[PDB]
Amino acid sequence: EVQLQQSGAELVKPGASVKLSCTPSGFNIKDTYMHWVKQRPEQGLEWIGRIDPANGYTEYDPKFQDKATITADTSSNTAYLQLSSLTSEDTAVYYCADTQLYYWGQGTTLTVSSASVAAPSVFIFPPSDEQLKSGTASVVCLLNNFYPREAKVQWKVDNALQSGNSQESVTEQDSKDSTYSLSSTLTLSKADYEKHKVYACEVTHQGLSSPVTKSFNRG
């Protein structure tokens, strides 16, 4: 299917390098036009540059010609932006762009990190009883001192995934740990709160071998 799949998160330190394998699918490989795009955290969309794999011709933007490196193979249905001298500012989800499509995929989650690939510290906060008296419910799941930003937080109520009711925020601690902390709150009503009878918080991160699910219940 028409998508831009690439290599997963990779914790290369600043100054290192690694190729990033775009994987066109569904649509014909074609490989005369292939751009890449990237965006620094909450920056504007910057266009890496394009190339002509079939005709072996390169057309990057003037800005990033210093980093300009990409090849592709016609048979393999795969494109490869070589990249050198990676910096933490380049950390992004790199979509392997191209004209004739103007559509972008999941983005190559770049993971240029300075600290270690640590695991998050997970905690659950049951709602306060006066909060229940107020008529609303607020369960809080805590992630403490993890790195990098990229983590998945989702809810399992009655062992079922919950969506459309969550809200999250994160903090930056650049002083000593240089780690990252996320505060996720999930809001429900009282009726659902006592009828559901079970709750859990599961978190996915690069720094731990398998996602951990740790639950709480009344009692």
Partner 1 sequence: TPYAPEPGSTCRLREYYDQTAQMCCSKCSPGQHAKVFCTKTSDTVCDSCEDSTYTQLWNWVPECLSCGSRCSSDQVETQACTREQNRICTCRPGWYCALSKQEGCRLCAPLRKCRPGFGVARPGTETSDVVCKPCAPGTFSNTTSSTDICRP
Partner 2 sequence: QIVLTQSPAIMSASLGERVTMTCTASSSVSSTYLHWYQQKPGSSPKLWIYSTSNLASGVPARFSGSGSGTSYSLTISNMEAEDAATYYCHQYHRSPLTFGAGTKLELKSSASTKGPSVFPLAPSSKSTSGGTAALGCLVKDYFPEPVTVSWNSGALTSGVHTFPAVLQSSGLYSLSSVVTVPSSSLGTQTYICNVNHKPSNTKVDKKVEP
Residue 99 within binding range of partner 1, rule CB under 8 A: yes
Identity at 149, one-letter amino acid code = R
Residue 62 within binding range of partner 1, rule CB under 8 A: no
Residue 57 within binding range of partner 2, rule CB under 8 A: no
Q: Are 180 and 142 spatial neighbours (Cβ–Cβ below 8 Å)?
A: no
Candidate residues 34, 37, 72, 86; the one interacting with partner 2 per rule CB under 8 A = 37
Q: Are 161 and 202 spatial neighbours (Cβ–Cβ below 8 Å)?
A: no
Backbone angles phi, psi at 88, to 5 degrees: -65, -25
Residue 24 within binding range of partner 2, rule CB under 8 A: no
How many residues bind partner 2 (CB under 8 A)? The answer is 42
Considering the complex, what minimum distance in angstroms separates the CB of residue 27 from partner 1? Answer: 10
Report which secondary-structure segment, H or E, holds 169. Answer: strand 166-173
3-state secondary structure of 145: strand
d(CA 149, CA 151): 6
Residue 38 within binding range of partner 2, rule CB under 8 A: no
How many residues bind partner 1 (CB under 8 A)? The answer is 6
Residue 181 within binding range of partner 2, rule CB under 8 A: yes
d(CA 142, CA 181): 8
Residue 213 within binding range of partner 2, rule CB under 8 A: no
- Cβ closer to partner 2: 69 or 145? 145
User: Binding mask 19-38 vs partner 1 (x if CB under 8 A, - otherwise)?
Assistant: ---------x-x-xx-----
Stretch that binds partner 2, among 8-16, 17-25, 72-80, 98-106 (CB under 8 A): 98-106
Given partner 2, partner 1, none, residue 207, with its beta carbon under 5 to 8 Å by kind, binds none
Backbone angles phi, psi at 100, to 5 degrees: 75, -10
Q: Are 147 and 178 spatial neighbours (Cβ–Cβ below 8 Å)?
A: yes
